[PDB]
Symmetry: C3
Subunit: 322 residues, 3 copies
């Protein structure tokens, strides 16, 4: 036997009314596939003669090891997008533009506009360095090293307040000798306030002056500084004013002193002084371009008055002539 | 021939002892599947009549193109989690709160507590702007523009040290004329140290005063300032003290000067002076409410003493009366 | 009928010349698989008797739900790599090292080297706190609280400029009383410039002194301060110099004053003064260790000259003797 089976093309079968017997095979001539009858169904309703169920295959791929689109998308949701985060390089670029608390170099202006005190507060209690150090070795400039300004007439605090305990000078100003001399001063002060002293000084020295001024000859030449003075006072009118009545020096002691009010010495020898009572001493021959009004003499070394002379002359006259 | 095959349900086959001949087909009536005998195996041990091996399929999916869960997880491991990284927007928010080295506006206190010197160091050698600029146009305040304070009696440095070379004033203080006059000063200094001068000044002028004081009439009225002075000195006791012996002005020259020790002028004309030797000159008639003790006259314009008069009178008496 | 089919091993078939009739089945004895003839093809060119097309399977896996390697890689490309981005913890570590505009504590030096003015600009117009507060409660130190230095002789601005409107002192320096007295001053000023006054002061007081100096006894003892003065002046030569000709005090009024040029009081009583014309008054008995050159007396209380005496004596002599 070489058995052949009922057979036609797959399309021909699908329209055929031929009913295969139970187990009887029919063959699709253009596909090479067989189906077996159940004794009632037409051929298009028969199944193939061997399984076509993925579950039944051998050598299946490892499907359960493969990622799903859903699970992948869920995980990617937790990850940061490149676009919306800075790289370390970018972060470093940004951070390098900002000041370290450790210290740094500012290249632009630091402004304070406020929202122990101070906008700037420097506590040196634990260190041996300076607080604020400003310097310029520039030839010239358009601004001072430091400027303090108040703008309202009511302003009720100082521009600069120095509260000092210590063993050296609270404030020291040194104007160094220039290569060539110029018109400048170490300290210049002006006030246009008529109801307060431009400068006030108070001290409580045991054996020194409250203000001590020394003039030192800038030259070795004995009379180079013949026009200099330790203290120089000028008393002037207002521009376009009619004059002035201001005094030069005024000395008082509101509680009463027993000291000399003015004492002038040279080589530490008293040369001229005004005692606490107003009497004076002068060490050498002196001159008044005028008269001197004084009391009649009582001691031999007292200056005689005109009245004393005239009386002596009159008495002698009366005595001689009888 | 319509051939039919040995056949029963799949479950019936699996328990059957029927041995199919080699190539003989048996059919599962409930599944439609066939298996062919090997001449010895029972039906449950026979394979189906067509392959069920995934490898042999046509139109296979592209498995090798699909991502594995393992490879995906390995790659995701290298990616940054959203939760643990700042967005650019967040980074910007944080950076904007920090000071740029370029410059910026502080709104709170900058404190220095330290771990060429200075906690703050400003070098203006290459620029033409100011160093530290403090100002207030506030009506009033509870603090000074600038405050320097030292707290220990041993402190061995100054609060403020000015070391100045230049062509203008090292320190300039201007107290501007107020709308209406008040009791304030441009500079006020107090010291309670008994062993040092409250203020010390030293200069080496060729032809100027070490201290120069000018009083200017605040008015055009010729005697408006009749009660003013360029220098005013007061000499007072301690509160609850018994008195004072302090001197007013003390002048000396420890090395010896040939200059006038006090020289008083008006309109640049000498009116009264004390020479380096202590002799004085006064330009006009003067008054002592007391006697004047001096030497016997030798020149015609010398004041005569009582002794000189008395002797002249005595000699004349002796001469007349024989 | 138990039908058996032409059959041999799969390898034997692949070399066989046997041509199966159309639909005739041949069996591979070692594989259990059948193929059916087309009436012309050799067995290796026949297809199996049931489909082997993946598309036709039932129970297929959800391939379209599985992620591809390509799509996964494309998505991962948009995600940030851990290595190249800082964590929040790292960002915080870096930010905490930088200064907040709100305020902060510097622990290192803040330098300004510059690329209303000031490297540091403080505007207190809207607040009641201080600007710059420097202090030290250290026992000692190697630097001042504040230092201002200029290095070139041409420098044309001040180290410190105070421009002040207000109701209190522009600058106040208080040297507090030390536990034990020492050699220090509240303000020390030196200048080596020969062409400018070390210090210049100008004021326009109505009824006060431009400079006011008070000395206060540091003790309750009436003569404790017997060696003190409100003002002390010294006039010295240069080291290795030949001497000095500098004056002590120089007073002038370049426009002409009608005030007393020097007025010395005690307990607010005039004791000695030099009038605007140079005549003086002294309240008590005085002494010159020398002669006094003056004018011939015209009033009874004028000091007599030697010439006046000698003339009176001569006239009396001529009168008596005829
Ligand atoms: Na005395
Ligand atoms: Na002496
Ligand atoms: Na001289
Ligand atoms: Na003149
Ligand atoms: Na007058
Ligand atoms: Na009085």
């Amino acid at each position: 036997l070489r058995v052949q089976f009922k057979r036609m093309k797959a399309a021909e079968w699908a329209r055929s009314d031929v009913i295969l017997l139970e187990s009887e095979i029919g063959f699709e001539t253009d596909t090479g596939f067989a189906r077996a009858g159940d004794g009632h169904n037409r051929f298009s309703d028969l199944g193939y003669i061997s399984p076509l169920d993925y579950n039944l295959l051998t050598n299946k791929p490892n499907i359960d090891g493969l990622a799903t689109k859903v699970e992948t998308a869920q995980k990617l949701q937790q990850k940061a997008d490149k676009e919306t985060v800075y790289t370390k390089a970018e972060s470093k670029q940004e951070l390098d533009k900002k000041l370290n608390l450790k210290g740094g170099v500012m290249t632009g202006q630091l402004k304070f506009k406020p929202a122990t005190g101070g906008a700037v507060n420097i506590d040196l209690s634990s260190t041996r360095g300076a607080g604020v150090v400003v310097y310029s070795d520039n030839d010239t400039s358009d601004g001072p090293l430091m400027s303090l300004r108040t703008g309202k007439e009511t302003f009720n605090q100082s521009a600069l307040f120095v509260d000092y305990k210590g063993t050296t000078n609270a404030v020291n100003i040194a104007m160094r000798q220039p290569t060539t001399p110029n018109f400048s001063s170490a300290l210049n002060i002006t006030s246009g306030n008529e109801n307060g002293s431009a400068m006030q000084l108070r001290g409580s020295e045991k054996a020194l002056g409250t203000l001590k001024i020394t003039h030192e000859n800038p030259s070795i030449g004995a009379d180079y500084d013949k026009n200099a003075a330790a203290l120089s006072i000028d008393i002037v009118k207002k521009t376009n004013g009619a004059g002035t009545a201001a005094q030069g020096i005024y000395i008082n002691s509101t509680s009463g002193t027993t000291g000399k009010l003015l004492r002038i010495r040279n080589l530490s020898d008293d040369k001229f002084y005004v005692k606490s009572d107003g009497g004076f001493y002068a060490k050498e021959t002196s001159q008044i371009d005028g008269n001197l009004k004084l009391k009649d003499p009582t001691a031999n070394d007292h200056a005689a008055t005109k009245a004393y002379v005239d009386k002596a002359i009159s008495e002698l006259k009366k005595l001689i002539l009888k």
